[PDB]
Amino acid sequence: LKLLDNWDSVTSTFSKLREQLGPVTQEFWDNLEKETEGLRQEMSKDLEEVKAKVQPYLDDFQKKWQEEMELYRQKVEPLRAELQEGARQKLHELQEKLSPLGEEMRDRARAHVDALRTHLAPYSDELRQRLAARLEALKENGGARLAEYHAKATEHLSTLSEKAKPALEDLRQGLLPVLESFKVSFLSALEEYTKKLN
């Protein structure tokens, strides 16, 4: 109700901020000029010296890079041949290994898979008989269980309806009057609430 009075105080403080902003921006600009000019003299000296520092530094670096690269062509380059030759010999050594051991490993695999043909295959065949027996039990007990499920389902169904019938009646017989009473407690609440917050 006193919003206008409260907003006035805020308008006053806002105006107070404006009272400060005036001289504040004035001195801020003066300070900015001081800083910019201060950094300006530093920048001129920095930039000027940079030309006399980066250039000789680049030259120094270029010389080092030249030596570095030269040394690389006198090391990495010739060593590339030494390493390549070593790699070639290594590859040759590997060839003389990947061939006998390669065929040997393949023969090992042959002996492995071949064994599996007389190991896994005949075993899965035996398992087929066992699976048939297991599945038979699953079908036998399962079929019986299906009847049990149906029986218990119908039994439980009778029990469920035996509860649903009276429960719903009782629930309705209780919810109806309770709802009416609830409406009363709601009406009194809503009416009073709207008056308190009016």
Ligand X SMILES: CCCCCCCC/C=C\CCCCCCCC(=O)OC[C@H](COP(=O)(O)OC[C@H](N)C(=O)O)OC(=O)CCCCCCC/C=C\CCCCCCCC
> Which residues are near ligand PCW by CB under 6 A?
14, 17, 46-47, 50, 53-54, 57, 64-65, 68, 116, 120, 123, 138, 153
Instruction: Mark the breaks in the chain: residue after which each occurs, C to N over 2.5 Å.
Output: none
* Alpha carbon distance 120, 112 (integer Å): 11
48 binds its own copies (CB under 8 A): no
Minimum CB–partner distance for residue 70 and ligand X (Å): 11
128, 174, 179, 183: residue in contact with its own copies (rule CB under 8 A):
174
d(CA 190, CA 196): 10
List the single partner that 47 binds among ligand X, its own copies, ligand PCW, none, CB under 5 to 8 Å by kind.
ligand PCW
What is the C-alpha separation between 116 and 137, in angstroms, rounded? 30
Minimum CB separation of residue 69 from ligand X in Å reads 6
The nearest distance, CB 172 to ligand PCW, in angstroms, is 15
Note whether 105 binds its own copies by CB under 8 A. yes
CB atoms within 10 A of CB 124: 10
Question: Sign of torsion, CA 68 71 77 79?
Answer: negative
Q: Which stretch binds ligand X (CB under 6 A): 11-19, 33-41, 147-155, 187-195?
A: 187-195
How many residues touch ligand X under the rule CB under 6 A: the total is 7
Burial class (CB in 10 A: 0-12, 13-18, 19+), 113: exposed
Hey, what are 50's tokens? 């940079």
State which of positions 108-167 bind its own copies (CB under 8 A): 108, 111-112, 115-116, 119, 123, 126, 129-130, 133-134, 136-138, 140-141, 144-145, 148, 151-152, 155-156, 159, 162-163, 166-167
Assigned token pair, 162: 């035996």
Q: Is 77 in the site for its own copies (CB under 8 A)?
A: no
Q: Least distance (Å) from ligand PCW to the CB of residue 184?
A: 28
How far is 70 from 41, CA to CA, in rounded Å?
Answer: 42
The residues of the shown chain that bind ligand X, judged by CB under 6 A, are 65, 68-69, 171, 190, 193-194
